[PDB]
Design a protein around this ligand. Structure first.
Ligand code: SAH
Lengths: 243, 6
């Protein structure tokens, strides 16, 4: 029979496991956190070799039944390295139905990230993929090159370096396009992605309305205030509104 | 140090 294996983030691998008990076969799927959008096809040991975009229409005796989307929407396990993606311009189909990039409502923030649709709290909205570099590197260079750096764990930083900060040059993920707020409606949270691998995602903390801008706390060290000058500014301002 | 969300 069927096995589902959930990641802590709510995504899952589902399928009949093989003789040796591995997520291996032609009819395995990764199902996104909405429990509707899925990537269906060939996996070996839980790695997506060839996943075709599908909708989960229902389950019978716990067995998922998918409808393929028209096209040849194929996706592949593609962990970044110097290389952000093998398909810089191929969007995440789950992300694409949920967010879009537009001018930010925050004065001189530039661009920002918005909900296409109204969602609940705890809803994963967008992915933060990037190149995978080291803290020493990140911390050895000027802030001007550190606009999109995001701490993944204690060995790894995730970056979206110029010119991938432009959507016409990179749009496989959009998490980096979310602006900072000290009164955020989202957080960065761990996510295990079938294409990007282990990255971070952007998740709502509260219900959000269609066309609201999504914001997160960048969470730079307040006292080592090691941050760019615009953040140091918004911090003085905010703490005044607080103290 | 110089990156989001450490
Ligand atoms: N609260 C804020 N105030 C001013 N600028 C901000 C901001 N949050 C993010 N930014 C800008 O966005 C960068 C982080 S990336 C976020 C997307 C960016 N607004 C863009 O147009 O590409 C920062 O270096 C800063 O220039």
């Amino acid at each position: 029979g069927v096995c589902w294996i959930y990641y802590p983030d709510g995504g899952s691998l589902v399928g009949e496991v093989n003789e040796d008990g591995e997520m291996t076969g032609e009819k395995i799927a990764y199902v996104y956190p909405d429990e509707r959008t899925a990537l269906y096809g060939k996996f070996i040991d839980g790695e997506m070799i060839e996943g075709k975009l599908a909708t989960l229409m229902s389950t019978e005796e716990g067995r998922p039944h998918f409808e393929l989307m028209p096209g040849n929407s194929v996706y592949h396990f593609d962990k970044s390295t110097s290389c952000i993606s093998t398909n810089a311009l191929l969007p995440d189909p789950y992300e694409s139905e949920r967010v879009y990039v537009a001018e930010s409502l925050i004065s001189s923030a530039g661009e920002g990230l918005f909900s296409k649709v109204a969602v609940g709290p705890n809803t994963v909205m967008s992915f933060y993929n990037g190149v995978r570099i080291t803290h020493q590197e990140v911390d050895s260079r000027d802030w001007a090159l550190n606009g999109n750096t995001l701490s993944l764990d204690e060995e790894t930083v995730i970056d979206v370096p110029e010119p991938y900060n432009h959507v016409s040059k990179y749009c496989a993920s959009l998490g980096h396009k979310a602006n900072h707020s000290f009164t955020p409606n989202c957080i960065y949270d761990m996510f295990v992605h079938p294409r990007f691998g282990p990255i971070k995602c952007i998740r709502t903390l509260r219900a959000v309305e269609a066309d609201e801008e999504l914001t997160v706390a960048f969470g730079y060290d307040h006292s080592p205030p090691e941050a760019p000058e615009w953040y140091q500014v918004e911090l003085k301002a905010f703490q005044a509104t607080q103290q | 140090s110089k990156s989001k969300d450490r």
